Symmetry: C2
Subunit: 586 residues, 2 copies
């Protein structure tokens, strides 16, 4: 028995306030009935399906049903209940299930989609401003080695006009969207110890440099996302003012105008971020704090989204811990509130959250558009390709396990959510992925191909594309090497080619995703959008041949190889050692 379905054309078609749903089946004991299990306002529905007279592909029987769209919430969840005389079987994002799937692990399509539809067309690039580029006309020097000493106090001098001036490089790289680390007034170099949410830190060029950057990116058609740090302030902020270098500080004034914006124990110690005293945690019980951060018309969240700043959204730092009373009490309401405020100021605003852990409860409640997809994308690859994980603990997973992991996670997400998940191989909070591969550094191009072809929006971490390496923070924030002698020019070109493949093909931006093969060293999946197919074959080990069973998903006119040295012929994949290949259908 075989089944196929993806939450996208050719399997679904919207027509006259109905969502038509098509299931493919093949095999020797097909169910004489199939029920479309759908859902309206959380009520499970049993919708009849009927066989189509015409086979869509050789040996395949298509069943078709219909979801009425006029009622019910935008997110439409569904699965397939195959019925024989004596038994039943479910078809799900995670293949066949002998007992019913979880409601939150069904196929899901958001209709209407009120999310930021532009995100799926982007290539993102994350910039740690101090370490990217100095402007022409502007404390360590650029070539001085990064050391473990005083990580938070060492400034190399990168600034925002440096980014503006490097926009032609980013354009040629294929970048269409920037995510900046914090830029607001803060004493440190990473600047997550915020001192003024209302001003750009002059060390990066002040408010004028960020306005120029906003103008310049608009001119080039590039989106711009700011780092929003709202779980905690810095202890130098006027609200907290630990060093009494001002008046009215919550820290040393029981009568401060912001005494209730922080939580102090019966010992006097304020609650902070994971025991970092420089980062006192904000108490979202306070109705005045809520108004200042997101509630009011000129709250911090909306401020940088309205003119003149007109930012395209917010990365939410430590989104999972924000809440009341010193911890994450009422976390989901407040993150929903932040997102709601942002979409009020800008309906197409992108709001994604930093989630090192499992983001599904946040995303399944729709309190944010997306997450930094560490759990669903990054760590599976650290495991499969680099033998490591979030804690740098040894990891030994084969392709079966890696794809069970990746597919299980996204089964909790609608198609539209999957398409805008924020995927990267590393960040300012992890060791460089190049370094993590260790002796297996020749696998790095596999990961770059995978980054641009797995569902979600890819984000290059500045410098990855030219081969910078280093261990975890502090050593992952090296100055970007602008000397081509210090650049991996071959790696740069692969990044260029992948972003070109992405712009070129709708399936890599909008397409469903079906894992076709996943055994030991080899992963094969296909992206699927209308008649278009994109086949990707990853081999982390030595040369091998793999038979691909006839799949109606792969029944095309022909395949044109676009990247890598793999060869597909008569259902046999010839894959060189440590390779990734991408075929486009003809």
């Amino acid at each position: 028995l075989k089944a196929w379905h993806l939450p996208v054309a050719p399997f679904i078609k919207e027509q006259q306030e109905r969502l038509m749903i098509t299931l493919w089946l093949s095999g020797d004991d097909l169910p004489p009935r199939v029920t479309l299990r759908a859902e309206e306002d959380n009520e499970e529905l049993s919708l009849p399906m009927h066989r189509l007279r015409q086979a869509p592909h050789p040996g395949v029987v298509a069943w078709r049903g219909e979801i009425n769209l006029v009622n019910g919430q935008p997110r439409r969840r569904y699965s397939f209940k195959l019925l024989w005389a004596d038994r039943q079987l479910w078809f799900t994002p995670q293949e066949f299930n002998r007992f019913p799937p979880a409601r939150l692990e069904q196929f899901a399509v958001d209709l209407p989609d009120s999310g930021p539809q532009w995100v799926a067309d982007q290539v993102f690039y994350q910039i740690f401003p101090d370490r990217f580029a100095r402007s022409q006309s502007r404390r360590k020097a650029w070539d001085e080695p990064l050391t473990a000493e005083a990580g938070g106090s060492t400034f190399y001098g990168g600034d925002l006009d440096g980014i503006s001036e490097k926009l032609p490089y980013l354009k040629q790289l294929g970048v269409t969207a920037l995510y900046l680390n914090p830029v607001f007034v803060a004493p440190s170099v990473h600047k997550y110890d915020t001192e003024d949410y209302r001003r750009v830190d002059p060390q990066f060029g002040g408010d004028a440099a960020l306005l120029r950057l906003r103008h310049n990116t608009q001119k080039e058609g590039m989106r711009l996302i700011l780092d929003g740090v709202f779980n905690h302030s810095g202890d130098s902020h006027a609200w907290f003012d630990r060093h009494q270098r001002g008046s009215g500080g919550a820290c040393h004034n029981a009568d401060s105008p912001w005494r209730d914006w922080y939580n102090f124990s019966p010992e006097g110690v304020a609650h902070d971020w994971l025991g970092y005293a420089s980062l006192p945690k904000l108490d979202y019980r306070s109705s005045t704090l809520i108004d200042e951060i997101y509630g009011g018309e000129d709250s911090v969240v909306r401020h940088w989204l309205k003119a003149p700043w007109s930012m395209d959204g917010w990365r939410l730092a430590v989104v999972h811990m924000l809440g009341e009373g010193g911890g994450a009490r009422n976390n989901l309401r407040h993150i929903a509130g932040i997102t709601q405020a942002a979409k009020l100021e800008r309906p197409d605003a992108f709001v994604f959250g930093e989630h090192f852990g499992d983001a599904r409860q946040w995303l399944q409640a729709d309190v944010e558009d997306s997450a930094m997809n560490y759990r669903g994308f990054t760590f599976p690859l650290w495991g499969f390709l680099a033998n490591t994980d979030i804690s740098y603990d040894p990891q030994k997973i084969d392709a079966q396990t890696c794809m069970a992991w990746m597919d299980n996670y996204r089964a909790g997400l609608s198609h539209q959510q999957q398409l805008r998940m924020f995927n990267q191989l590393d960040s300012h909070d992890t060791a460089r992925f190049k370094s993590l591969l260790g002796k297996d550094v020749a696998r790095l191009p596999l990961a770059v191909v995978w980054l641009f072809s797995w569902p979600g929006v890819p984000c290059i971490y500045y410098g990855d594309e030219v081969g910078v390496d280093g261990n975890n923070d502090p050593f992952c924030r090296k100055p970007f090497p602008w000397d081509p002698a210090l650049q991996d020019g071959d790696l740069l070109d692969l990044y260029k080619r992948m972003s070109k493949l992405r712009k070129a093909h709708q399936a890599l931006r909008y397409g469903g995703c079906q894992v076709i093969y996943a055994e030991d060293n080899v992963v094969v999946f296909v992206r699927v959008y209308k008649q278009q197919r994109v086949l990707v074959a990853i081999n982390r080990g030595e040369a091998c041949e793999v038979v691909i069973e006839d799949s109606p998903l792969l029944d095309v006119n022909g395949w044109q190889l676009k990247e890598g040295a793999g060869a597909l012929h008569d259902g046999v994949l010839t894959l060189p050692a440590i390779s990734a290949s991408v075929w486009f259908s003809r």
Copy 2:
């Protein structure tokens, strides 16, 4: 490799604001390190564990760690990360996992537990008031057969003083808590078409009869839960007033004081419950509607919870669809609001929701205490024992699948949530389970044993205990046969004995639950609380012998058989055909 852990003593112990956590391991290639993956305010933690010098059982190595309780939210989620030099493996509620478990499918213990701790000590009994008992001093006659005609208009005359008068029968049955179907003024016999939330329907004896019932149950130490129907009103309610048999109705007055409490289309048709025009749906966008239902001090939810009514809580009818704008928009906020209001009036109030489907998103967000556990308890048994399901579609699942199903569902719930899940074999909205067994009716006692020994609180559906049967509503609401000639007296006695076993043994009220064996016809599980063990063996088919491997969970002084004709000796279970046995440890 083997592992054991349950979210209860002997595996966990709270001491000096720390939660101590113990893992059992056995096998030939044990991990030299184990990390306790815990969570504080949603931040994943890596806590070290250390081997205990003393083996807790032969061949078992114990690791122990510690969760700091002074910070973080009440619900403490955790799992075990076994680490070797080259690889890792997770231990979870669902056995070993090669990739990390979902955050919401870990072990979880609620500390402090702010839920209704009395629920786990209860035996519930659900009464459909018209069909239970007529009072001594009071339209069909009691012995007239139930027909398909005019189901909603046929009254047999049961009333609340009938229940009061039958309290000695319920006491002897072992019942400690009642759940009543709706009793408020409504035209129908089931009375889910509410006309007045503020008055008891005189057909059941009016307000005086319910006060007597509240007094009488208090006198007998019995709890009392009312059916709260807040997703929709009846169309005869004054607010809606479809038949203009009053003034000010939302239905026929664009200026009604409650026009905004209902949602009308640009056609004039109000939104209702699943196309039943007699049940117009309430619009929880309205700030005045929110205040009347749960927001205000004398709102409907709090009204029946304060004196003189002093009810113990609310069953929430159609809890999953309640929301704004004609559908389930903002459903979770409003159900949280209802529960919050109830616990404000009565801190130990029990609020559970009607969930035919998958309740996990509601329970994982803690918007309610519990659910009618159709998905986690009822339908697995309909499948395993009666070959059917929610849609009365054929079902063929063996013990492996049934227990994978039951254990997967509860893995999404903390220990405390599992203990108060509202388990029943049938209800006023399903065919009688006795009828569903069809030719396999001899399996009915297996299900009764299972109802009283699976985690959760059992609820007898009135008449089940004496063998009434019938198909789905209308035929599942027969008049209760008070003639002992029409009663299955042997079935009645099993119910009595099971509720006695439950009162007698802490493990059946508080205990963890570990499935030990689940192959084909046979299910074996053990409830576990401190040194106490309760072993349950269910065999749905012919006589068989089953070997039980040595389990440290089963290493006790001895076993005393308490119910059924099974025999345990030297790791061999001798199980008669179609049997259920319960052993208590010695």
